[PDB]
C-alpha cells in the first residue's frame, strides 16, 4: 500500500444493486465464477508465497541525506564546498520533478474518477497543479543542459531584482 | 477533329501517335536492323554465359558497371565551374540556408521578445 | 603483354567440403566451437544475464528514492500548510542582491 | 519499333494490332456480349471496307487517322487480363518462383527427403553439360560474321543433339509453382 | 577504469600467442568478456559521476557509449573473420591487433576526465582507423579515402588542441570536475568566436557536419566492414561526446554562435536523407543515413536543453547499432556477389527468407519505428527542437518522411521483386551471418524495455 | 478450385470455338486445318480467332506471338506452354 | 574481388624525378641508381 494523504481518494460512495427486471444478469455469476475460479487460486497462492517471505523478515532503508551548505555560502571556485552544495541541488532538484510527478498523478486520477463532471469537482487539484508547475517553472525552466546551482541561483537573483525593481516602482 | 494529343515530360507521345513511327525509308531500316544487330550480339553474349553450367556468380555487365562508375566517379572529372554551375551551385547550396536562417531567426526573436515581455503563453511548459 | 600475376582465385563456397558449416571456418571442428564460443558466450552469457543485471540495477540513478522523498515531502507540507514547492530555490534571507 | 525477331513491325502487323486493340476497347465500352457483338461486327465492316487499298501512302494515311481514331475513342480503364501485364495479378507468383539452381544449396538431409526427385535431377544436370560444348560449336558454326542478326535461336539438327541454349527455357519455374 | 583498460591491453598478447586456428575464437570468447565486464559501470548516481581517479570518470554519457564501443569488438571479430580467411597469418593477427588498439583508445578517449587527454585519445583513434581502411579495405579508392578522413580530422583538430591549451593556461586545468565549477562565462567577442570555432569545428568534423561531411562516403564505403562497423556506430559518436563535454566552457555564445551550424544540420538532414533517394550504391546510401541522423545529434546538442541531450545520446546508441547491423547486412550481400551496386541483386527474400527479415528489422528501426530507441531519441530530439522554434517540425517532419522512403526502398529493392536470373550464387545465410544480425538487434530491441540506461546524465 | 488444363482439354476447347465459328465449317476443321491455306481466312479473321481463344482460356497471347498461330494445333501448343499441362 | 593492390600505371607515378611534372620541370630526369655520374 501506499500513504492516502500524498495519494488521496474521496470516500467510495457504490449504489446499491436495485433490479428492475426478472432477467439475471451474468455478471453477477461471472463474478461469482470469477470469485471461485479465480480469486481463491491468486489469494491461496499469494498466502503461501507471504508464508514463506514471513519465514524469513529483513528490511531496507530510505536514504536520508543530511543538508549541507547551499551555493550561496560557498566561496567562488571553492570545490569542495561547492561539490557538495552541487550534489545536494541536483538531489533537490530531482525530488522537485518528482512532486510536479505526483501532483499530475493527483490531477489524472481525479480526471478519470470524478468522470464527465470532472471540471468541476477537480478545481483543487487543478489548483495545486497550477501552483506546483509555477514553483517548479520559477525555479528550474530555461537553465540549459549545462545546469548548476549557480545557473540556478543567478536566476533567481535576476527574478529578485526584476521583482525589487517592480516593487520600488510602484511605489 | 479530334483533340491533337499534346505530350508532356511525364506524360509521353505514343507510339501510334508519333509520325516517325511510319518511316518506310531504306536509312530507317538500316537503323532499326543495325539495332536489332546490337541488341541480338548482346543478347547472344548475355545468354552464352548465363545458360554455362560450369558458370557460378554473377554475370558483370559493363553497362551496370558503366552506370554507377558515371554517377559517382566520372562527376567531378567532367565538372568545370562556368556561370551555370556557380548560380545553380549558390542557389541550391546557400540560397536555403540564408531563408531557413532568416525565417528561425525572426521566429526566435519574436518569442524571445514575447517572453522577456511577459506575452508568451509559457504557463504549463516545464519540459524543454 | 602485361607482367606476371596471380589469376582471380575463384571464390569458395563453405558449404561444398562442409555443408554443416556454420561459417566461421573450414575447419568442421573449430567452425563448430567458433559458434558455440559466440553463442554460448553472447547469448547464454552477455545478453541473457547482462539484461538480467540492468532488470536487477539497485536503483538506477536514484529515481526511486526521489519519488520516496517526494513522497515524505509533500506529507510533510501538506500537514503543515506549506505550499507544495517554493519558487525561491534558495531562502532570500541569505542572498545579497546588488543595489540600485 | 521493338520485336525479337523482326527489326520493325510491318504495315499488316500495324493494321492488326490496331484492330484487336481497337475491339479490346470497344469491349470494354460495350460490356455486354450482344452490344459488343453488334458493334464488333460494325468495326469489322469499317476495317473491311479499305482492306483492298493498293495505295501503301493511302493505306499508310489511313492507318495514321485511324490510330487517332481510336487514341480519342479508347476506354481510359480497358480490361486487362488478371495474368496480363498492368492486370491485378500480373507477376503475382514471382515470389514463388524460386530458381532450380536453389536445389544445389540444400542440405544433404532435406536432399534424402527427395531421392528419387534429386537422383532425377542429376541425370538433368548431367544431360545439360553434355550437351553444353556440342550446343556452343553449334552456334558459332551457324552464326553469321559479325555476329548474329536477329535474336532467334537455331532448333537442333542432329539426332542426339539439344537445341542450343536450352537449360533456362526447359527449366523455368511453373507460373503456378 | 583500469579493470577494462588492462583485459583490453591483454588481448594483444591474448591473439598473439594465439594458435592458428584459434585468433578468433580466443579474442571473440575474451572480447564478449570484456563486454559482459562493462556493464558494472551502469553504477550511477542521480546526482555525481562515477569518477573512479583522477585521469578516470564516468557519467551516463561515457557508460552507454563504453558498453556500445566494448560490445562492438566481438561483432567486428565476427564480422570480418570471413573474408580475412586467406590473409597472411600475421597480417590476420595484425588487424585483430588494430582493432584491439582501437577499443583501447577508444575506452580511454570516453572516460578521460582531463580534456587534453581526450584529446590525445580521441586523436590517437585516427591510426588504427586509418590503418585499417587504408591496408584491409578492398578497392583503390581506399587511399584517398585514408587520406580525407585523416585531414578533414586533424585540420579541425589542431586549432582544438591549441584552444584546449589556452583553457589550460586560462583556467588552471582542464579537468571537466573541475571545469563543472570554475566555468565562466564567455561573452561575446571575436576572440571567443574563433574560441568557439576552434572548440567546435573538431567534434564538427567527426559527427559529421554537413558540407564537411565529405570524408564519410568514402571512409565508411571502402572500408572493410569491422571499419564500417566501427566508423558509423562509435567514431561518429566522439563528436557529439565531445560536444557535449566541451559545450559547458562556450555558454553564452553558444546561442548565437549555433545558429549557422543548426542550419547547416536542419537543412542537410534533408539533403542527406534525400540524397540517400538516389544512390546506387548501398553502402553509400548507409553512410548518408549516417549523416542524416547524426544531423540531428548536432542540433539537439547545439541547442542545449535537457530532452535535447537525452535525445541525442539515445539516438547516438540507437544509430551505432543500426548503421552497425546495416553495414553487415550490405556486407553479408557483397560477400555472395562481389559488388556494393543495390540494384544488382534484388529479390533477396525469395533467396534468403530470414536475412530479409533481418533487413526488414534494421529498417523498421532506421525508420524509428516506436518504441524503438530509435524512435526515442527521434522524438525527445523533434520535441525540444519544437520548443527551440515551432517552424523546425515541417524541416524535422519531412525528413521523417524522407528517411522511412529511403529506408524502404533499400528494403523494396534488395529484398522484394523478381530475383536476379544471372546471379546464382547465392549461398543460403550462414550461422556466423544470422548471429550477427541477432547480436545487433536483439540488444537494440531490449533496450526499449528499459531506456533509461541510455538516456544520458541529464536523465 | 483451378481446375488443372489437359492436352485433350485444350484441344477439345480450341475445337469447340472454332466450331462455333461460322466462317469455318465444322466437318472440314481438324487438328491441322491452316486457317489461311485450309479454310480460307483473313488475317482479320485470324486475329478475331485468337481474341476468341484468350476470351475462352482467361489469358492474353501477345500479338507477336498470336500472328504465328495459324492451326488449332498451333494454339494447343501455345495454351500448353503457357500452362505447363502435362506436369 | 580480391583486394586491390598498386599495379605498374599506379606505381610509375612515384618514380618520376619530381612528384607533379609542371612545364618547368619536364626535362629532369631522375638520378643514376648509384647515384654516379659517367665522367664525359
Ligand atoms: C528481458 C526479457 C525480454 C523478453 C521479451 C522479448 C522482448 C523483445 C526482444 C527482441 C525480440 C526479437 C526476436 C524475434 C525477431 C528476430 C528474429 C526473427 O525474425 O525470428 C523469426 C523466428 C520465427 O520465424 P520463422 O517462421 O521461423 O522465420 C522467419 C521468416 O524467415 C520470415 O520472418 P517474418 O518477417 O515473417 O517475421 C518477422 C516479424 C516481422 O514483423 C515485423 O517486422 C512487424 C513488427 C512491427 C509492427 C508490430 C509491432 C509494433 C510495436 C508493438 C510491440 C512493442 C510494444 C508492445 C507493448 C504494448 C504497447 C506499448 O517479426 C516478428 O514477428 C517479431 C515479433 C516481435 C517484433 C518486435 C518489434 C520489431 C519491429 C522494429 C522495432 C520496433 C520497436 C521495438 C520494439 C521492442 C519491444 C520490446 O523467430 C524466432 O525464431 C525467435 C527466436 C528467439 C527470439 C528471442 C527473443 C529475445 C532475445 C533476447 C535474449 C536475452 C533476454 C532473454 C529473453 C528471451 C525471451 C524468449
Ligand atoms: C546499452 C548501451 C550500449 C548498447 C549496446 C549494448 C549491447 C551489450 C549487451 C549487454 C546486455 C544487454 C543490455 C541491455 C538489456 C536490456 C534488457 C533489460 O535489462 O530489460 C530490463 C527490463 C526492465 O523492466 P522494469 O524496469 O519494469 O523492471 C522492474 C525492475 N525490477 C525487476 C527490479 C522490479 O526488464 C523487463 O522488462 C522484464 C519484464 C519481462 C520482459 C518483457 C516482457 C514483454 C516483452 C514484449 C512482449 C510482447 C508484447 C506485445 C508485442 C507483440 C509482438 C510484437
Ligand atoms: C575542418 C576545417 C575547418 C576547421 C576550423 C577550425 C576552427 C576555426 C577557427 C580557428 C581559429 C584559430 C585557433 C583559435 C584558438 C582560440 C584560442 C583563443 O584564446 O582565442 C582567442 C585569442 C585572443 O587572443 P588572446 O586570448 O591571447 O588575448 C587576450 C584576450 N583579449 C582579446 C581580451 C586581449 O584569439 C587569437 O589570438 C586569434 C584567434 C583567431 C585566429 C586567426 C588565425 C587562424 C584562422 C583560422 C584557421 C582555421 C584553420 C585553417 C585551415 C583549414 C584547413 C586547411
Ligand atoms: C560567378 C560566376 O559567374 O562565376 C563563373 C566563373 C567562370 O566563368 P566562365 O563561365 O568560365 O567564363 O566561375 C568562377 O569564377 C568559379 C566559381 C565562382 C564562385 C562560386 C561560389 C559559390 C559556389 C557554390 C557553393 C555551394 C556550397
Ligand atoms: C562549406 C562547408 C559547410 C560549412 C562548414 C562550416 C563553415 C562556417 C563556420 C563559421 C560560421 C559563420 C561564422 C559564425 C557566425 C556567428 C554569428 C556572427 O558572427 O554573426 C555575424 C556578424 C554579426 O556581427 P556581431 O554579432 O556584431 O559581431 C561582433 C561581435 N563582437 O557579422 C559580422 O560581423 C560581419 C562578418 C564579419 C566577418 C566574419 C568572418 C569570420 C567568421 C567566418 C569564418
Redesign the pocket.
Known amino acids: 500500500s501506499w500513504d492516502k494523504d500524498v495519494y488521496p481518494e474521496p470516500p467510495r460512495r457504490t449504489p446499491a444493486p436495485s433490479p428492475q427486471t426478472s432477467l439475471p444478469n451474468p455478471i453477477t455469476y461471472l463474478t461469482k465464477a470469477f470469485d471461485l475460479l479465480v480469486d481463491r487460486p491468486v489469494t491461496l497462492v499469494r498466502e503461501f508465497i507471504e508464508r514463506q517471505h514471513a519465514k524469513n523478515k529483513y528490511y531496507y532503508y530510505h536514504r536520508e541525506f543530511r543538508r549541507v551548505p547551499d551555493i550561496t555560502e560557498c566561496h567562488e571556485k571553492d570545490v569542495l564546498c561547492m561539490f557538495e552544495a552541487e550534489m545536494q541541488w541536483k538531489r533537490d532538484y530531482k525530488v522537485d520533478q518528482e512532486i510536479v510527478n505526483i501532483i499530475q498523478e493527483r490531477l489524472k486520477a481525479c480526471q478519470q474518477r470524478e468522470g464527465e463532471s470532472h471540471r468541476q469537482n477537480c478545481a483543487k487539484e487543478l489548483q495545486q497543479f497550477t501552483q506546483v508547475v509555477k514553483a517548479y517553472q520559477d525555479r528550474y525552466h530555461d537553465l540549459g543542459a549545462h545546469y548548476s546551482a549557480r545557473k540556478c541561483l543567478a536566476k533567481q537573483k535576476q527574478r529578485m531584482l526584476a521583482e525589487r525593481k517592480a516593487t520600488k516602482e510602484a511605489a | 477533329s479530334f483533340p491533337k494529343y499534346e505530350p508532356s515530360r511525364l506524360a509521353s507521345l505514343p507510339t501510334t501517335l508519333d509520325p516517325a513511327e511510319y518511316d518506310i525509308s531504306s536509312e530507317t531500316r538500316k537503323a532499326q536492323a543495325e539495332r536489332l544487330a546490337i541488341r541480338s550480339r548482346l543478347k547472344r553474349e548475355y545468354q552464352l554465359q548465363y545458360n554455362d553450367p560450369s558458370r557460378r556468380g554473377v554475370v558483370e555487365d559493363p553497362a551496370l558497371i558503366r552506370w554507377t562508375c558515371a554517377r559517382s566517379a566520372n562527376v567531378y572529372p567532367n565538372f568545370r565551374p562556368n556561370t551555370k554551375t556557380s548560380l545553380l551551385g549558390a542557389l541550391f547550396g546557400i540560397g536555403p540556408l540564408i531563408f531557413w536562417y532568416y525565417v528561425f531567426k525572426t521566429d526566435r526573436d519574436r518569442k524571445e521578445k514575447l517572453i522577456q515581455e511577459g506575452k508568451l503563453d509559457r504557463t504549463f511548459n516545464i519540459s524543454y | 603483354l602485361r607482367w606476371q600475376e596471380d589469376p582471380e582465385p575463384e571464390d569458395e563456397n563453405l558449404y561444398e567440403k562442409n555443408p554443416d558449416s556454420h561459417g566461421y571456418d573450414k575447419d568442421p571442428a573449430v567452425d563448430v566451437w567458433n559458434m558455440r564460443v559466440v553463442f554460448f558466450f553472447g547469448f547464454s552469457i552477455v545478453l541473457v544475464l547482462g539484461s538480467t543485471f540492468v532488470a536487477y540495477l539497485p536503483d538506477y540513478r536514484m529515481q526511486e528514492w526521489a519519488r520516496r522523498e517526494a513522497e515524505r515531502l509533500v506529507k510533510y507540507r501538506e500537514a503543515h500548510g506549506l505550499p507544495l514547492m517554493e519558487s525561491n530555490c534558495f531562502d532570500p534571507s541569505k542572498i545579497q542582491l546588488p543595489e540600485d | 519499333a521493338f520485336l525479337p525477331s523482326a527489326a520493325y513491325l510491318t504495315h499488316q502487323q500495324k493494321v492488326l494490332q490496331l484492330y484487336k486493340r481497337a475491339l479490346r476497347h470497344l469491349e470494354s465500352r460495350c460490356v455486354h456480349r450482344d452490344k459488343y457483338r453488334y458493334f464488333a461486327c460494325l468495326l469489322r465492316a469499317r476495317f473491311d471496307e479499305h482492306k483492298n487499298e493498293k495505295d501503301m501512302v493511302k493505306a499508310t494515311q489511313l492507318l495514321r487517322e485511324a490510330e487517332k481514331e481510336f487514341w480519342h475513342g479508347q476506354h481510359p480503364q480497358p480490361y486487362i487480363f488478371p495474368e496480363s501485364p498492368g492486370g491485378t495479378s500480373y507477376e503475382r507468383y514471382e515470389c514463388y518462383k524460386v530458381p532450380e539452381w536453389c536445389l544445389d544449396d540444400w542440405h544433404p538431409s532435406e536432399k534424402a527427403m527427395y531421392p528419387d526427385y534429386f537422383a532425377k535431377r542429376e541425370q538433368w544436370k548431367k544431360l545439360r553439360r553434355e550437351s553444353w560444348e556440342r550446343e556452343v560449336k553449334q552456334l558459332q558454326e551457324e552464326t553469321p560474321v559479325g555476329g548474329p542478326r536477329t535474336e532467334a535461336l537455331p532448333p537442333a539438327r542432329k539426332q542426339g543433339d539439344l537445341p542450343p541454349l536450352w537449360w533456362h527455357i526447359v527449366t523455368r519455374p511453373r507460373e503456378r509453382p | 577504469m583500469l579493470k577494462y583498460i588492462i583485459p583490453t591491453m591483454m588481448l594483444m598478447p591474448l591473439t598473439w600467442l594465439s594458435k592458428n586456428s584459434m585468433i578468433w575464437i580466443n579474442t571473440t570468447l575474451h572480447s564478449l568478456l570484456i563486454s559482459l565486464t562493462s556493464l558494472l559501470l551502469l553504477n550511477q548516481f542521480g546526482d555525481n559521476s562515477l569518477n573512479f581517479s583522477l585521469t578516470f570518470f564516468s557519467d551516463s554519457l561515457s557508460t552507454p557509449l563504453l558498453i556500445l564501443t566494448m560490445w562492438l569488438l566481438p561483432l567486428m571479430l565476427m564480422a570480418s573473420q570471413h573474408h580475412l580467411s586467406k590473409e597472411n597469418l600475421a597480417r590476420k593477427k595484425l588487424f585483430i591487433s588494430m582493432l584491439i588498439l582501437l577499443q583501447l583508445f577508444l575506452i580511454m578517449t570516453f572516460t578521460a576526465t582531463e580534456l587534453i587527454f581526450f584529446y590525445i585519445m580521441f586523436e590517437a583513434t585516427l591510426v588504427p582507423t586509418l590503418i585499417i581502411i587504408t591496408r584491409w579495405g578492398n578497392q583503390t579508392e581506399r587511399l584517398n579515402a585514408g587520406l580525407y578522413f585523416l585531414?578533414?580530422?586533424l585540420?579541425?583538430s589542431?586549432?582544438?588542441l591549441?584552444?584546449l591549451i589556452?583553457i589550460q593556461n586560462?583556467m588552471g586545468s582542464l579537468n571537466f570536475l573541475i571545469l563543472q565549477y570554475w566555468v565562466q562565462p564567455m561573452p561575446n567577442?571575436?576572440?571567443?568566436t574563433?574560441?568557439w570555432?576552434?572548440?567546435?569545428?573538431?567534434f564538427?568534423?567527426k559527427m559529421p557536419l554537413y558540407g564537411?561531411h565529405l570524408w564519410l562516403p568514402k571512409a565508411h564505403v571502402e572500408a572493410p566492414i569491422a571499419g564500417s562497423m566501427v566508423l558509423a556506430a562509435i567514431l561518429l559518436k566522439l563528436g557529439g561526446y565531445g560536444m557535449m563535454r566541451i559545450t559547458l566552457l562556450l555558454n553564452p555564445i553558444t546561442d548565437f554562435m549555433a545558429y549557422p551550424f543548426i542550419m547547416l544540420s536542419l537543412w542537410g538532414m534533408i539533403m542527406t536523407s534525400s540524397i540517400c533517394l538516389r544512390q546506387t550504391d548501398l553502402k553509400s546510401l548507409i553512410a548518408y543515413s549516417s549523416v542524416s541522423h547524426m544531423a540531428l545529434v548536432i542540433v539537439a546538442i547545439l541547442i542545449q536543453t535537457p530532452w535535447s541531450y537525452m535525445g541525442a545520446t539515445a539516438l547516438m546508441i540507437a544509430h551505432g547499432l543500426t548503421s552497425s547491423m546495416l553495414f553487415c547486412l550490405a556486407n553479408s550481400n557483397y560477400e555472395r556477389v562481389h559488388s556494393r551496386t543495390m540494384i544488382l541483386a534484388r529479390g533477396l527474400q525469395t533467396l534468403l527468407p530470414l536475412m530479409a527479415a533481418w533487413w526488414l528489422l534494421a529498417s523498421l528501426t532506421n525508420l524509428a519505428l516506436p518504441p524503438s530507441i530509435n524512435l526515442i531519441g527521434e522524438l525527445f530530439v523533434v520535441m525540444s527542437t519544437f520548443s527551440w522554434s515551432n517552424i523546425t517540425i515541417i524541416l524535422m517532419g519531412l525528413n521523417m518522411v524522407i528517411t522511412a522512403l529511403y529506408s524502404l526502398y533499400m528494403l523494396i529493392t534488395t529484398q522484394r521483386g523478381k530475383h536476379t536470373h544471372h546471379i546464382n550464387n547465392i549461398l543460403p545465410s550462414f550461422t556466423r551471418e544470422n548471429a550477427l544480425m541477432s547480436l545487433h538487434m536483439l540488444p537494440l530491441l531490449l533496450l526499449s524495455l528499459n531506456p533509461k540506461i541510455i538516456l544520458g546524465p541529464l536523465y | 478450385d483451378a481446375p488443372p488444363l489437359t492436352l485433350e482439354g485444350i484441344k477439345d476447347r480450341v475445337l469447340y470455338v472454332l466450331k462455333l465459328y461460322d466462317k469455318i465449317d465444322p466437318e472440314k476443321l481438324s487438328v491441322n486445318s491452316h486457317f489461311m491455306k485450309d479454310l480460307g481466312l483473313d488475317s482479320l479473321d485470324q486475329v478475331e480467332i485468337i481474341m476468341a481463344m484468350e476470351d475462352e482460356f482467361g489469358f492474353e497471347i501477345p500479338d507477336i506471338d498470336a500472328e504465328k498461330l495459324m492451326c488449332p494445333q498451333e494454339i494447343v501448343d501455345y495454351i500448353a506452354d503457357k500452362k505447363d499441362v502435362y506436369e | 574481388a580480391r583486394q586491390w593492390q598498386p599495379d605498374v600505371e599506379w606505381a610509375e607515378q612515384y618514380g618520376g624525378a619530381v612528384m607533379y611534372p609542371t612545364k618547368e620541370t619536364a626535362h629532369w630526369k631522375p638520378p643514376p641508381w648509384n647515384d654516379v655520374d659517367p665522367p664525359k
Open positions: 585531414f578533414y580530422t585540420a579541425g589542431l586549432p582544438l591549441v584552444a589556452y586560462t567577442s571575436w576572440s571567443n574563433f574560441m570555432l576552434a572548440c567546435m569545428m573538431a564538427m568534423v564537411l
